[PDB]
Amino acid sequence: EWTGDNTNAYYSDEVISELHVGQIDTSPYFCIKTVKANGSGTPVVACAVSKQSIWAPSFKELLDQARYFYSTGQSVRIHVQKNIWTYPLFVNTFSANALVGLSSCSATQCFGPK
Amino acid sequence: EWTGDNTNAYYSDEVISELHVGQIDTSPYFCIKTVKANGSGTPVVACAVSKQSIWAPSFKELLDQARYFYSTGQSVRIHVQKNIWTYPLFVNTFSANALVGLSSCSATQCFGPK
Amino acid sequence: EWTGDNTNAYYSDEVISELHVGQIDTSPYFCIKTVKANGSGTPVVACAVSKQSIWAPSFKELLDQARYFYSTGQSVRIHVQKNIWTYPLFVNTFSANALVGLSSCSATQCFGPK
Amino acid sequence: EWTGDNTNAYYSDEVISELHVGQIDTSPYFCIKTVKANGSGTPVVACAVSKQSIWAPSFKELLDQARYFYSTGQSVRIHVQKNIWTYPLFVNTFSANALVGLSSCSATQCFGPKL
Amino acid sequence: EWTGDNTNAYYSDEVISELHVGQIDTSPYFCIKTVKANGSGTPVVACAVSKQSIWAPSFKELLDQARYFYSTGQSVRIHVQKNIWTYPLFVNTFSANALVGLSSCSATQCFGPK
Known part of the structure; x- marks a missing residue:
């Protein structure tokens, strides 16, 4: 598996807002939760769970990186795998998206798989 | 168990003051210790204990997150489970509330279970 | 044992100065090293030593917290247990006080056992 | 092995840009991704992968250090070992360079190994 | 062993410059690398190696503390043990000094062994 697998979805020029x-x-x-830097579109919600899913090994790093980008407010590309989390109240509160990667974004491109 | 279980209490738009x-x-x-952003109501006190209660595995993450929200002074939703800690002097000094979650808050809603 | 045991000493409205x-x-x-925020009194010196004394389990947390409070320079309450370190040159350079807790002192009285 | 082995490549006065x-x-x-602080030359891309390659033990330290140098935007020397990552799509997206060291730089030199 | 052993060397009123x-x-x-806060004298270079020397146990703490003092640029006392590292190219690039301690420094004294 890889963050950049084409079976994963991504959203560019986002800011981590929550x-x-x-x-x-x-x-x-x-x-x-992330939103487009320019205010357009629909927010993205994604979660990482420490002992769950194939993405468990990256929990800490993703948490640290999420915190980092959250604190800088810079534009990023967020990479997710859809339909992973299954507890209904959890999914309803957040989403079924697993967070699988975060890339910084300049004015032109993002530094990550596309 | 889950942060968002309805047997847990939460308090929105709080600022970590201590x-x-x-x-x-x-x-x-x-x-x-947290207080309502507008100064109304009564303070909330909650604790996490690294080797105690079912919430033990999240100790580090919660500590880290508390520190962050404490340093920014931003409004957050605090999630607790009541009547967990039992050492009377401890409870009297602080409370019996186990800290079970922390959510950022936008101007309208908080990003967490309700 | 507990940070708030009456056999432990504490000092309020201190600033971590070194x-x-x-x-x-x-x-x-x-x-x-901590000194009164208002410039009065005698400095308090306290140490935490990894894997030594009954307070060993909290070393990391205390180190992190000391660093945090050191960096903001905010007013704090320091909790110590006296006469724990015995290595004489060490004690002479620093003290025999084991650091067993740190509390913020912002809004009302300090937020910790008293 | 050592960051400063002459079989490793390095690039001075770079800024971590991504x-x-x-x-x-x-x-x-x-x-x-790093680019020359003075705007010249071509970007360098390097990666570190947890539990992979001989450089695995330094993953955490390198990640933290990269984050720090990234946040300050200061000039650094980046040390890499070429042709380590082999997964082709990954390499195409990024590179085959393993990140093996990071050094701060002054006006006249960088604080790290050179040839 | 101790940071403050008189067989270790130290240098006061230094700034971590690299x-x-x-x-x-x-x-x-x-x-x-450290230099006198006033720019006089010769730089001190010291290293810590996570699995080597009697000082290995303090690697993480020293790394964190070095990073901290480096980011503030504040005046410190650096404690080293000479003639520890032996790989010749490593010593040529850096030095044989093991880093064994870091102390904050006020205008008058430093908070550490002397």
């Missing part, structure tokens, strides 16, 4: 930290089924997790 | 770090029964712990 | 990191007898350690 | 974090084959990884 | 991170023989390491 951050949540909690626990579910003995596992710490976090979620983020 | 932070304490210590140890009890071989376990590091931290507590925070 | 920070030292080193190693002794296979253990990383840190020490802090 | 940062990416993701996962590949069970491993968290990060990549950076 | 930072390097790398790997040697499967070990992450870092080096720092």
Whole structure:
């Protein structure tokens, strides 16, 4: 598996606008919400769960990187894998998107798979 | 179990106004005090204990997140489970509230379970 | 044992004015010096030593918290247990106080055991 | 092995201009892009991958350091070992360069190995 | 062993002016260069190697502390043990000095062994 697999979706020129930290089924997790830097489009929500999914090994790094980009407010490309989380109240509150990557974005391109 | 379980309480648009770090029964712990952003109502106190309760696995993440929100002074939603801590002097100093989650808040809603 | 045990001493409205990191007898350690915010009184010196004393489990958290409070220079309450470190040159340079807790002192009285 | 081995390449007075974090084959990884502080030359891309390559033990330290140098925008010397990552789509997106060191730079030199 | 052993050398009223991170023989390491806060004298260069020397246990703490002092540019006392590192090209590039401690410095004294 790879962040850049074409079965993963991504959204460019986003800003991380919200951050949540909690626990579910003995596992710490976090979620983020991102919106287009230019105000257009629909927000993206994605979560990472510490002991769950194939993306579990990157939990800490993604959390640190999410925090980093959240704090700078810079434009980023967010990479997700859809339909991963299954607990209905959790999905309803957040989404079924697994966070699988974060790339910085300049004015022209983003530094990551496309 | 989940941060968003309806058996948990939450308080929106709070600002973390105090932070304490210590140890009890071989376990590091931290507590925070939060107050409504507009100054109304009564303060919320909640603690996380590294080797105690079902919320133990999230100790580090919660600590880190609390620190962050404490440093920015931003409005957040705090999620707690009541009546968890039992050492009477501890409870009297702080509270019996276990900290189980922290969410950023926009101007309208908070990014977390409700 | 608890940070708030009445056999521990504490000092309110202090500012962390110095920070030292080193190693002794296979253990990383840190020490802090605190002084009254208003300039009065005598400095307090306290140390935490990795894997040494009953307070060992909280080393990391205390180190991080000391660093945080050191960087903001905010008013704090420092909690110590006296007569713990015994290595004489170490005690002479710093003190025998084990650092066992740190509390913020912003709004009302300090946020910790009293 | 050593960051300063003469079989490694390095580029001085670079600024970390981009940062990416993701996962590949069970491993968290990060990549950076750097460009000359004075605007000359061509960008350098390098990646570090957790638990992969001989440079695996330094993953955490390098990630933290890259984040720091990225946030300040200061001039650095970047040390890489070429032709380490082999997964073709990954390489095409980024490069085959393993990141093996980062050094701060002054006006006259960088604080790290050179040939 | 102790940071403050009189067989270790130290240099007061220094500023950490450079930072390097790398790997040697499967070990992450870092080096720092320090100069007198007033610019006089000769730089001090010292390194820590995570799996080498009696000082290995303090690697992480020293790395964090070096980073901290480096980011503030504040005056410090640096403590080293001479003639520790032995790989000749490494010593040529940096030095044989092991970093064994860092102390903050006020205008008068430094907060550490002397």
